[PDB]
Design a protein around this ligand. Structure first.
Ligand SMILES: O=C1NCCCNC(=O)c2cccc(n2)Nc2cc([nH]n2)[C@H]2CC[C@H](C2)O1
Lengths: 298, 271
């Protein structure tokens, strides 16, 4: 059963479940252990645990926190994950005076886009991208974590759960009540995380669905049928929304060159149809120093 | 690769991963010889049963086909199962499926209720863990019906080649799904990759030309499947095609995705 696993500290409890740092004291091999009390589980293995395990099995990538094993013991399900020492909110908090150096910001974003581009090419939406879910290690790596709210999408997509993404990282099309959604909600979240890395502050700290929308509008401008076709026909769109003007990106992300401000604005395009892809973001000039030559044929 | 160029990814890479997936998901038309106490017709009766319970509880076709694919993949891992615990293995498969696929699934007790007390809630919870442990927690297959959803979108494309917002007619989908549903009840179907079964079923309702545009597969690829499917095809045409229902509380843009049952009893036997 639980053989060579010594619990070393509770890392947390908070929707993801109960998670401990553990040592393989034979090996000095450090894992994250997620504990699921089956006994107290009316509906058996939770739907969110079945989805996260199957998804992560088939999502092996360097920028995705690996599922190593799934051990069933004593009416306990244990999920054993690769272990990373810190999450990106704590890092960003610890770095709020000094700043994160722009080399590390570019690197961290680049890596996140590579993870996200892996998920999307594998037809998986993360749907809960926030700094609490981005884990860093001691070698300059960042990785996607918590696939409990993630979902496989069909090439022809279908209407998915509507209660998705924590409020500050939530895309305007979800707040306005869009029927369908896909890859662009994840890209709005990374866009929000990018500015946050730059400013040392949440980009859009809303305290309600409507206050989130208004904070989005106050910074990017009240949208219309020109910038975002269909917006005025959307269920939660109200002709009364106030009229604010987009703001110069040199003052909402002051630290950021031409290329950064380009990338972020395309990451924050109102129209889900136009919002840049993860793959295309990796090919942005902002990264021109990190990305290098490839060819193509027909 | 019948996908047009994608914004989000390499249309070729997307399609390869999906083809690559089909390969890492094995199936065996001859798994019931591992269980020599068991008759091929037993499986049909069971899958016919799941489809029933899927319609009542207004579960998605994707939910039904996940159950089917959990059933046939699980048995291939096992040995010398008896008819006794086929109801338990199937309803437990549907339980896992329903939890994976529906926004608001049924509750555990409904899955025991239907069993007429031949299965307990806590037998179901035991089996679900053995099934999931046995399949090595690989519960993300491309179902037979999922390929039909792919093909139908590709068939209905315009200028800005959006493969993601679903644009196609519900009644054509219903009619091909009917032919695939009947085809699954017979273990010989597991000879044919799920991609091919769906492609082959569309062909019977259309042409080798449309099939190639939407699937990629060349006439030779589906040739044998098409031949095998012939009898199931003609039997569905002898009777006429069924009509798209509206479902209570199920919207209308979603009404084709709801699983359905007609008396597919004798229909399979003509073959
Ligand atoms: O589901 C989640 N949620 C991520 C947020 C909760 N975890 C933390 O806040 C945190 C903080 C400091 C170190 C750390 N986690 N280490 C860790 C954790 C995991 N691997 N490594 C595994 C455990 C399940 C996956 C990933 O996380």
């Amino acid at each position: 059963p639980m053989e060579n696993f010594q619990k070393v500290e509770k890392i947390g409890e908070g929707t993801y479940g109960v998670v401990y740092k553990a040592r393989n004291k034979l090996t000095g091999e450090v894992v994250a252990l997620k504990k699921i009390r089956l006994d107290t589980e009316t509906e058996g293995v939770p739907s969110t645990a079945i989805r996260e395990i199957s998804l992560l099995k088939e999502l092996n990538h360097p920028n995705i926190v690996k599922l190593l094993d799934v051990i069933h013991t004593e009416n306990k399900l244990y999920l054993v994950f690769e272990f990373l020492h810190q999450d990106l909110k704590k890092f960003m908090d610890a770095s709020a005076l000094t700043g994160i150096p722009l080399p590390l910001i570019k690197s961290y974003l680049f890596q996140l886009l590579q993870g996200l581009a892996f998920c999307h090419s594998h037809r998986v939406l993360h749907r809960d991208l926030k700094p609490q879910n981005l884990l860093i290690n001691t070698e300059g790596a960042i990785k996607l974590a918590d696939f409990g709210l993630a979902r496989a999408f069909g090439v022809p997509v279908r209407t998915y759960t509507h209660e998705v993404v924590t409020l500050w990282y939530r895309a305007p099309e979800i707040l306005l009540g869009c029927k369908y959604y896909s890859t662009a909600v994840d890209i709005w979240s990374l866009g929000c995380i990018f500015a946050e890395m730059v400013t040392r502050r949440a980009l859009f700290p809303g305290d309600s669905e409507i206050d989130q929308l208004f904070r989005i509008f106050r910074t990017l401008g009240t949208p219309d049928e020109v910038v975002w076709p269909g917006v005025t026909s959307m269920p939660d769109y109200k002709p009364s929304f106030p009229k604010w003007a987009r703001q110069d990106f040199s003052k909402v992300v002051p630290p950021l060159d031409e290329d950064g401000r380009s990338l972020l604005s395309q990451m924050l395009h109102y129209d889900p149809n136009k919002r840049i892809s993860a793959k295309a973001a990796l090919a942005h000039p902002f990264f021109q120093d990190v990305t290098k030559p490839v060819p193509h044929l027909r | 690769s019948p996908l047009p160029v994608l914004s989000w990814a390499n249309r070729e890479e997307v399609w390869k991963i999906m083809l690559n997936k089909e390969k890492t998901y094995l199936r065996d038309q001859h798994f019931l010889e591992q269980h020599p106490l068991l008759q091929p017709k037993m499986r049909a009766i069971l899958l016919d049963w799941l489809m029933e319970v899927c319609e009542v509880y207004k579960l998605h076709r994707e939910t039904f086909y996940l159950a089917q694919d959990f059933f046939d993949r699980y048995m291939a891992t096992q040995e010398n199962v008896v008819k006794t615990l086929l109801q338990l293995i199937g309803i437990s498969s549907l339980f896992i499926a329903a939890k994976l696929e529906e926004i608001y699934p049924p509750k555990l007790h409904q899955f025991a209720y239907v069993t007429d007390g031949a299965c307990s809630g806590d037998e179901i919870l035991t089996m679900e863990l053995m099934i999931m442990k046995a399949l090595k927690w690989r519960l993300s297959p491309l179902t037979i019906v999922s390929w039909l959803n792919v093909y139908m979108q590709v068939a209905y494309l315009n200028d800005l080649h959006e493969v993601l917002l679903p644009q196609y007619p519900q009644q054509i989908f219903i009619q091909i799904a009917e032919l695939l549903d009947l085809c699954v009840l017979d273990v010989d179907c597991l000879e044919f990759p799920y991609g091919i079964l769906a492609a082959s079923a569309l062909y019977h309702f259309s042409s080798s030309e449309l099939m190639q545009k939407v699937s990629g597969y060349q006439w030779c690829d589906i040739e044998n499947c098409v031949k095998w499917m012939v009898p199931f095809a003609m039997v569905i045409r002898e009777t006429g095609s069924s009509k798209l229902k509206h479902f209570r509380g199920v919207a209308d843009e979603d009404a084709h995705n709801i699983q359905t049952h007609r008396d597919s009893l004798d229909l399979l036997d003509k073959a």
